[PDB]
Write an enzyme that holds these catalytic residues in place. Structure first.
Site, PDB file in Angstrom:
ATOM      1  CG  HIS A 153      -2.131  -0.736   1.095  1.00 38.31           C
ATOM      2  ND1 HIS A 153      -2.169  -2.041   0.669  1.00 38.31           N
ATOM      3  CD2 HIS A 153      -3.395  -0.428   1.468  1.00 38.31           C
ATOM      4  CE1 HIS A 153      -3.407  -2.491   0.742  1.00 38.31           C
ATOM      5  NE2 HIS A 153      -4.171  -1.532   1.226  1.00 38.31           N
TER       6      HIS A 153
ATOM      7  CD  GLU B  37      -2.233   4.057   3.013  1.00 40.11           C
ATOM      8  OE1 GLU B  37      -2.254   3.006   3.685  1.00 40.11           O
ATOM      9  OE2 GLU B  37      -2.887   4.206   1.959  1.00 40.11           O
TER      10      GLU B  37
ATOM     11  CB  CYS C 298      -8.008  -0.121   4.749  1.00 41.15           C
ATOM     12  SG  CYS C 298      -6.910   0.013   3.344  1.00 41.15           S
TER      13      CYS C 298
ATOM     14  CB  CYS D 130      -4.357   1.703   5.802  1.00 40.93           C
ATOM     15  SG  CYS D 130      -4.357   0.658   4.327  1.00 40.93           S
TER      16      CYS D 130
END
Ligand SMILES: O=P(O)(O)O[C@H]1[C@@H](OP(=O)(O)O)[C@@H](OP(=O)(O)O)[C@@H](OP(=O)(O)O)[C@@H](OP(=O)(O)O)[C@H]1OP(=O)(O)O
Ligand SMILES: O=P(O)(O)O[C@H]1[C@@H](OP(=O)(O)O)[C@@H](OP(=O)(O)O)[C@@H](OP(=O)(O)O)[C@@H](OP(=O)(O)O)[C@H]1OP(=O)(O)O
Ligand SMILES: [Zn+2]
Lengths: 151, 476, 476, 152
Positions: B172, B174, B225, B286
């Site tokens: 992802h 981040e 998320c 996340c």
């Protein structure tokens, strides 16, 4: 609406000419009001450091250098053993604890389920509540069973 | 011939024919090969012409009429290029917004989009992965500078796991930003090792201390998320569903979205052999990882030996942003926690941008990609990896298949730390493994254990730790 | 109603929801997957209806017109299940094989499945247990006969343990096959007691010895859990990695994988009370159990009082790599060990199956089953055991649940051993417990203690012995 | 392949289809021994009078049907020995000092397992009347001390 447009057009040109670099304008009430930063993030520091001292690819340049120039930091690293503990106790819901806590014929089961319920109740407690519960546990056990405790 | 000149100049700069560039773009965009078709037609003057048809992203594309099959194929490839290039598909740069409002994060969003587009000029193939973006900005006084940039919204497959740590676990956007920030901090430490005045660190008590006035800011294109990013019209139900709004959430490999814990399979830790044969691997969401970074810092455990904990200053979300929900996801549910010194709970600022339009948005309904890219100020060059294995792929001698570990992998960080210590003349115990090296930080390990225990006590949920076999590789 | 009660009884006995079972049967007999239809019926005042039909074997399986989806779909599933109960048939596949190569173990693999379906036609309730399959073959001068066959890949739960030993602890196929082999050995010893010429045993100097030409072969459709399934890497690269990969592992409850412990970890012995408080039970993986069986024989401690140690002659696993990977887990670890006399290390032959690796049907959605089955030639009948509690469940005359211990439990083995005592006029001490009876074999106990001490010395691991209370029940 | 080899293969698949669990090989013909070769370490050709047919399904159940007089002694004597330790038996007795340490121990890193074990052991010795009254008081203490745990 004076100096506002002239202040804003500098940021409007920064995003194209020099992407990734923002230089706010200060020392002017008409220019600072264009982009009001949050008051929590509005910290003024007169340090000598500057943002233009950074260089792209600085890690490669620093690595390709003689080791003589660099100096030690006076720190030491030591080994340590990791924690292998898994999720040791099996968990059951709050409602599932309730029925075992109020069972009548606990003698026939050797108080196994009652002890498990007490243990899981202790697990949900915090540092202080569990300690106070434990102290009350021992106090009420000793008070009611002098023959077993008072030896 | 109705082909924009920018396609031709990009082809010339790339040094390859339009067919090769189109093939590379298709390979990066999808997981298969293009399908081609041709037609033969007569002409009133007795000449013969050829027409080429290609399929791009499930859409039929037909090239211009040409006298040769190769010319028709080139025209069709140019049409596919123009279709796939966002430079003319949507816009080049908007570069226009409304001022006089508290939208300082709009400037950061515009600057990171401009930086991503500028990086798309050096490499014309990294176009198309702008669905989700993330970046980190360094702020000193009134000056801002971007230091991180990465994309990706998928995770490692369960069948591609490895025990030597050369495969990325989470791809992802981040997480890769924090991974690059780790490398930036390493470079800053080396700069301090020779030029303390020129570095951001200072010689304070109990290891290095960040200079006053220096802060880090994180920007996310979409809501992370987990607790946040809710788009269900069914609305919350009873109190049990209300409690689920703060429960810990985990990712699912080869899937989409996040799942809610408490099922009949989340018990017992994950195993290497079990995951190898098909057991689902659990990855923290996340928002969960954002909470961990906010509580325990973003420098990690390995870097804690040299520098003090560093916390973010502000978080901005462009699309699907809720001020109340974002604060609850990362700050409210752990505000009452009291980590041991010097760790503390940081009251991060929650920010929102100015522009949002669902109809023209590119959040989820657009086409998905398998590869992700990351950029770092310390490295100065972009890196492209494949999410399915988390490994860099390259080609040589116009063929073969080369697999290369990513710069953000655990092994690369281990070698970087070993070089860090050796260049600084600081002795380290030998031999040592990755698991033992992380456990060296007594303060960070105790704080992490206390945070996990407090999370377990408050019935928020269970933190799914990775199997030990992922970090048993010996560091040389 | 329109649904026969026999269909509902079959649904209840199968343990699966009607929709899933109907879809599985539709996939079995046809090459398609059921798709429901939701045509609406309009009343004069307006209404919404659902039917669901599905077409199987050309019969109209149109269900009753009902208001909501649930009742219509369950009615359609029940009608389809009535259809499949009609025209009695089941999934069958002809076997083909390549020859003139090393395909001796392929014959064992194919015959094991063929024997599996033969029992299936007698008891249809054991269908779907093909995920884990193990068997034992006996070879006499080129003639081979199957002995045992069993399934199962789960273990006993912690809260269901008992001190009376009527509940099975491990339900793995490779252990239930060994239990069936011990039962067949008991039958063979009884036959020798009544007819020496017709038995495979002969009178030796100290105990019964197998006749020349008698050999036993073990076949497993998948690699055993533990060391043999850790990794597929060709080379370890470092000496530490080789040592780590060869270390012992243990299983936890129904967990599919294994957990590796370090030196002097889990040194405290397990306690009966602690397990009931919530502590998870630890059981060694199948690889370590196979190593122990090879080192100390498969006859066990109890049967050592009458017969000589027996070791497997060949092990076949239906996997493509095999070879060195399974050899390193089975023989190489204990190659340097020097046991006393009797008992010795056996160089068991390691074989690889021709073709038809079984991983798709052994590692995909078939783990949801909780019931294991065992079969042996001595008994001649099939038995199903629930892995949750290690006991067989049945319905009494009134339809209530009734539980009886399995025929391979510790109590039943002790009863059979005492029956052997009584039949052959072998007087024994009284009273004696199960632990005392096993400890009577001085040679076996000494060999086991020496093997455990040598395993500890070679830092390979620590054996997590079961609590003594599991064998404290008195023998009657 | 061949004709002898094909006939042997057809016989092998016929045996597979008709009689599962029974394997019959051919050795008098070198060609018939090449279709299904046996590893040299497992061949071990030997001369013996025993045969596979001596094995019967369900032979165990049939065996106990015979009476005692047809069974002969094996001349084996079994004596119990090697008792591990004189440790009492069903963990009914935890030494007074040990249980006092367990109940008064502050470090509860053992996930309260030992504390629950000590409580159960204490409750086991208590008589029927005095143990039940301890149950009511202990439930009251649990309810009052941490209501938030149980009030859900
Ligand atoms: O993915 P990241 O954001 O880099 O977080 C990771 C990682 O999480 P993933 O496994 O999801 O990648 C591990 O955490 P667990 O998942 O195992 O909980 C591990 O942390 P631990 O070693 O404490 O488990 C790890 O380290 P690294 O980034 O060097 O791989 C770091 O978390 P920490 O740096 O805090 O250890
Ligand atoms: O084949 P398994 O199902 O694993 O059973 C064995 C068997 O126990 P049984 O008495 O049930 O057959 C062993 O005993 P031996 O055959 O070696 O005499 C041994 O038990 P001991 O070491 O006490 O003999 C061991 O049990 P443990 O792991 O406690 O040693 C183990 O039983 P598990 O099922 O518990 O693994
Ligand atoms: Zn196993």
């Amino acid at each position: 609406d004076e100096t506002a447009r002239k202040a804003a057009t500098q940021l409007l040109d920064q995003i194209q000419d020099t992407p990734g670099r923002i230089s706010l304008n200060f020392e002017t009430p008409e220019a600072a009001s264009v982009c009001p930063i949050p008051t929590s993030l509005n910290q003024i520091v007169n340090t000598k450091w500057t943002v233009n001292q950074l260089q792209e690819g600085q890690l490669t340049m620093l690595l390709a250098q003689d080791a003589n120039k660099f100096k030690s930091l006076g720190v030491k690293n030591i080994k340590k053993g990791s924690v292998e503990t898994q999720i040791l106790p099996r968990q059951m819901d709050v409602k599932e604890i309730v029925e075992k806590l109020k069972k009548q014929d606990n003698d026939s089961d050797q108080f196994v389920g009652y002890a498990a319920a007490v243990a899981n109740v202790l697990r949900r407690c915090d540092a202080e509540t569990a300690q106070k519960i434990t102290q009350a546990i021992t106090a009420t056990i000793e008070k009611e069973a002098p023959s077993i405790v008072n030896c | 011939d109705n082909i924009p000149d920018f396609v031709k100049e990009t082809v010339e700069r790339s040094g390859k024919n339009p067919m090769s560039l189109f093939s590379e773009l298709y390979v990066h965009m999808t997981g298969n090969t293009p399908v081609f078709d041709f037609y033969n037609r007569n002409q009133p003057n007795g000449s013969m012409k050829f027409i080429c048809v290609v399929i791009l992203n499930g859409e039929r594309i037909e090239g211009n009429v040409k006298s040769k099959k190769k010319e028709a194929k080139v025209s069709c490839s140019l049409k596919g290029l123009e279709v796939v290039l966002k430079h003319v598909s949507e816009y080049v740069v908007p570069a226009v917004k409304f001022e006089e409002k508290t939208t300082f994060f709009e400037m950061l969003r515009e600057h990171t989009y401009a930086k991503f587009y500028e990086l798309c000029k050096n490499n014309a193939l990294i176009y198309g992965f702008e669905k989700v973006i993330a970046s980190v900005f360094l702020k000193i006084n009134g000056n801002l500078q971007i230091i991180a940039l990465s994309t990706g919204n998928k995770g490692l497959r369960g069948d591609k796991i490895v025990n030597d740590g050369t495969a990325l676990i989470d791809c992802h956007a981040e997480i890769l930003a924090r991974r690059g920030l780790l490398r930036f901090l390493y470079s800053e430490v080396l700069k301090f090792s020779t030029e303390p005045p020129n570095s951001i660190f200072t010689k304070g008590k109990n290891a290095l201390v960040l200079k006053p006035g220096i802060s880090f800011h994180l920007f996310i294109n979409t809501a992370p998320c987990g607790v946040a990013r809710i788009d269900k019209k069914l609305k919350p139900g009873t109190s049990d569903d209300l409690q689920n709004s703060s429960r810990l959430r985990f990712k699912i490999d080869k899937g989409m979205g996040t799942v809610l814990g408490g099922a009949s399979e989340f018990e017992a830790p994950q195993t290497f052999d079990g995951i190898m044969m098909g057991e689902r691997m659990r990855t923290m969401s996340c928002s969960d990882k954002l909470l961990r970074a906010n509580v325990l810092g973003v420098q990690g455990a390995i870097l804690s030996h040299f520098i003090d904990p560093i916390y973010y200053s502000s978080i901005a979300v462009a699309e699907l942003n809720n001020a109340d929900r974002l604060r609850k996801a990362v700050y409210s549910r752990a505000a009452t926690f009291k980590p041991p010194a010097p760790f503390h709970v940081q009251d991060v600022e929650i920010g929102e941008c100015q522009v949002e339009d669902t109809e023209q948005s590119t959040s989820a309904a657009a086409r998905s990609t398998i590869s992700s890219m990351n950029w770092n100020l310390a490295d100065g060059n972009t890196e492209v990896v494949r999410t399915s294995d988390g490994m860099v792929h390259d080609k040589d001698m116009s063929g073969a298949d080369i697999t290369t570990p990513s710069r953000l992998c655990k092994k690369n960080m281990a070698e970087l730390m070993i070089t860090i210590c050796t260049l600084t003349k600081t002795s380290v115990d030998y031999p040592i493994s990755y698991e033992e090296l992380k456990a060296g930080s007594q303060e960070y390990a105790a704080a992490k254990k206390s945070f996990i225990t407090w999370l377990r006590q408050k019935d928020l949920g269970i933190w799914q730790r990775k199997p030990r076999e992922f970090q048993m590789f010996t560091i040389n």
